[PDB]
């Protein structure tokens, strides 16, 4: 069981007849997935994992960059010294699950410890040929459409003492988020909004605040909106149906957790938290430094009904502790699903 790097390959259940661009890309870039993949539990062996130094993440990153290069073609791409022009037709866009697979001579160890924080020893290890299916959802602040924690909320970080290390909050219950650009009674084709059930979110940060306090005891735990910067990271940004949404989260990350109780202080209405969103055409790229420019949005109603399954938090540096939404490095998005896996060489 000697840890090792090697070129993984992706597998998917992509469908030959599907025009959706994830299917199209996986059709030529991945192999079909197995209906019954074998898994061999080993209750005896204990191996150490490290989700923050896992070469599987970097290989996934390169594939997703590569998928976006073939799929979401911008009208023009501006990178410092250059400007590339292409046809930018509108496209059908809906992420599908990708599995990562070890070539022969290597195996994938899977941690079965349902509260494993991503670092150190895992006592219950399995062997699989491929990971489970991971939807490559590119987003900031909120992790969408992932998998849930099995027991309690899990706090992951490379080092909770180092405030510059991103914190990944793995929820154990999804929180529904519905964003829509609706179909003069209309006035702007670039305005959208998201709805989140207030009590569901009140209960979430209550239990997230409980887990955070375990790590930062005797402190008031505050949630505050993003620090300033690029719009991609100061808002909850994500792609919906090919359109780039930027959703303001100031009413979302806005509460205090004192004396074991969470007190939401963001704005709310019919028991619902609303985020105002813009659809933007000029976006700052996450694949590399520069800008990409897209056509105006499609007609009709644009809706993404998603499941928040995790959060990206950052703690302010210095008698209190303040947490803001983070993200930006999509490697953390892949880490949040690949944490339990580790590629190993069967010498």
């Amino acid at each position, epitope marked *: 069981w000697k840890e090792a790097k090697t070129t993984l390959f992706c597998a998917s259940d992509a469908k030959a007849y599907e025009k959706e661009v994830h299917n199209v890309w996986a059709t030529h870039a991945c192999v079909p997935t197995d209906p019954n993949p074998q898994e061999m539990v080993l209750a005896n062996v204990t191996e150490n994992f490290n989700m923050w130094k896992n070469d599987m993440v970097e290989q996934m990153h390169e594939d997703i960059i590569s998928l976006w290069d073939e799929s979401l073609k911008p009208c023009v791409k501006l990178t410092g010294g250059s400007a590339i022009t292409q046809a930018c037709p509108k496209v059908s866009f809906d992420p599908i699950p990708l599995h990562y697979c070890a070539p022969a001579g290597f195996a994938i160890l899977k941690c079965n410890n349902k509260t494993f924080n991503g670092t150190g020893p895992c006592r219950n290890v399995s062997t699989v040929q491929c990971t489970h299916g991971i939807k490559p959802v590119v987003s900031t602040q909120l992790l969408l459409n992932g998998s849930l924690a099995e027991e309690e909320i899990i706090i992951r970080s490379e080092n909770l003492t180092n405030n510059a290390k991103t914190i990944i909050v793995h929820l154990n219950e999804s929180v529904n988020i519905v964003c829509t650009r609706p179909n003069g009674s209309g006035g702007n084709i670039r305005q959208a909004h998201c709805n989140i059930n207030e009590s569901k979110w009140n209960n979430t940060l209550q239990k997230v605040g409980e887990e955070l306090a375990k790590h930062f005891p005797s402190k008031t735990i505050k949630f505050e909106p993003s620090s300033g*910067g690029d719009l991609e990271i100061t808002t909850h940004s994500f792609n919906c149906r090919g359109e780039f949404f930027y959703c303001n989260t100031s009413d979302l990350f806005n509460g205090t957790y004192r004396n074991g109780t969470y007190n939401h202080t963001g704005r709310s209405s019919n028991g619902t938290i609303t985020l105002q969103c813009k659809i933007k055409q000029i976006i*700052n790229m996450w*694949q590399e430094v*520069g800008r990409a420019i897209y056509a105006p949005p499609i007609e009709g109603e644009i809706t993404c009904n998603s499941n928040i399954t995790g959060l990206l938090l950052l703690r302010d540096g210095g008698d209190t502790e303040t947490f803001r939404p983070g993200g930006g490095d999509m490697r953390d998005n892949w880490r949040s699903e690949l944490y339990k896996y580790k590629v190993v060489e069967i010498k």
Partner: nanobody, 121 residues
Framework: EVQLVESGGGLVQAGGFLRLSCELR????????MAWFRQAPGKEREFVAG?????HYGEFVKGRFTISRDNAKSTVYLQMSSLKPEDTAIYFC?????????????????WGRGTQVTVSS
């Protein structure tokens, strides 16, 4: 292994011009945004100027500073004009964790050693 080579700075007369530069080594430049923070004595490190896809400036800048990127030289530059005693501080180069700029110092995992800028009247 990542290192930031800082250049420029030191003593300026009030109203003068100064240039700061910072070469990123052991990392792919066009993968990371770069920024300058400053720390005056007794104060919190504060964001001055940063650039990934687009430049950002701290509120106290007021169009006096220009930040730019040189991909060929893996270097980012800060041109500071109309400097004032208020601008005296240790200036730190920083490499972002990503392609994006945050104003909060915790969006950065690599820091230069810091160079003193002193504006003398």
């Amino acid at each position: 292994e990542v290192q930031l080579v800082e250049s420029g700075g030191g003593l300026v007369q009030a109203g003068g011009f100064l240039r700061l530069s910072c070469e990123l080594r052991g990392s792919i430049f066009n993968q990371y945004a770069m920024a300058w923070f400053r720390q005056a004595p007794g104060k919190e490190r504060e964001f001055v100027a940063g650039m990934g896809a687009v430049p950002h400036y701290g509120e106290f800048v007021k169009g006096r500073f220009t930040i730019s990127r040189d991909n060929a030289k893996s270097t980012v530059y800060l041109q500071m004009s109309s400097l004032k005693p208020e601008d005296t501080a240790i200036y730190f180069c920083a490499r972002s964790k990503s392609t994006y700029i945050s104003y909060n110092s915790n969006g950065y995992d690599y820091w230069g050693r810091g160079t003193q800028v002193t504006v003398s009247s």
